[PDB]
Amino acid sequence: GYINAAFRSSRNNEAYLFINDKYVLLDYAPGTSNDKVLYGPSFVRDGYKSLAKTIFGTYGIDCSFDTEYNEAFIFYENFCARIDYAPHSDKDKIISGPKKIADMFPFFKGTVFENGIDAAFRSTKGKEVYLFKGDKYARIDYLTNRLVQNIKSISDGFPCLRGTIFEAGMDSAFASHKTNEAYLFKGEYYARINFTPGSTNDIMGGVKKTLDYWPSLRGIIPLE
């Protein structure tokens, strides 16, 4: 019962975190010690009416990423959908789907990504997204629907992760509102990384405990 998916909100310093078939809306306070749970924990089916009678409403969300405006891709196993998550309102809706991953992203056919994605986060560069499955990552443009480069080992693109628990996989991720930062999650741990698109960079550099960084999540995770 840890964080299985996440996406950055269009609202400043807010992110949606999905755990089992539930979620929380968090003010994650990147520059301040005043993190706070703004909504939830709530069942996906209760919080998102448009998702109530779907596989997402039944089983929850296991990967997602912000795109632009108020729209996000959400996943469950081999299925995905594009949604308007309509922050702080009643107005959520499915724009596209649900569709099999292979039908939404045909370049994934014949790869390990066609059966499910572990984690994803929105790049600062153009319409780019990083997606993770096992020890591999992919880099796509969601607007033109194109694989930007060959699928590579996580360690090829993020050398800073060699020798950490993230080397063989990530459970969940979201991009920060602070430029070129992102959070990676696995079990009780997170890392805050700094990245530069297209450059084999580094930093960092600190695998810590999620509950130390967000005390407002005490008693919410782990969810037994």
Annotated binding site for Ca(2+): 4, 62, 118, 171
Q: Nearest-CA neighbor of 166 among 178, 154, 157, 177?
A: 154
CB under 8 A, 24+ apart: contacts of 162-168: 164/191, 164/207, 165/189, 165/207, 166/191, 166/207, 167/135, 168/134, 168/135
Among 17, 44, 81, 220, binds a second copy (CB under 8 A): 81
User: Could you say which of Na ion, a second copy, Ca ion, none residue 173 binds, taking C-beta under 5 to 8 angstroms by partner kind?
Assistant: Na ion
User: Could you say which of Ca ion, Na ion, a second copy, none residue 58 binds, taking C-beta under 5 to 8 angstroms by partner kind?
Assistant: a second copy
- The region, left, alpha or beta by phi > 0 then psi within -120 to 50, assigned to residue 30 is alpha
Q: Nearest-CA neighbor of 7 among 47, 61, 65?
A: 65
Sequence letter at residue 208? K
Among 15, 19, 51, 63, binds Cl ion (CB under 5 A): 63
Pick out the residues of the known binding site.
4, 62, 118, 171
Please choose, out of 3-11, 54-62, 67-75, 174-182, the segment that lies near a second copy by the rule CB under 8 A: 54-62
79 in contact with a second copy (CB under 8 A) = yes
55 in contact with Cl ion (CB under 5 A) = yes
Q: What are 56's two structure tokens?
A: 């997402």
Please choose, out of 60-68, 91-99, 132-140, 214-222, the segment that lies near Na ion by the rule CB under 5 A: 60-68
54 in contact with Cl ion (CB under 5 A) = yes
Which residues sit at the interface with Na ion, rule CB under 5 A? 6-7, 64-65, 120, 173-174
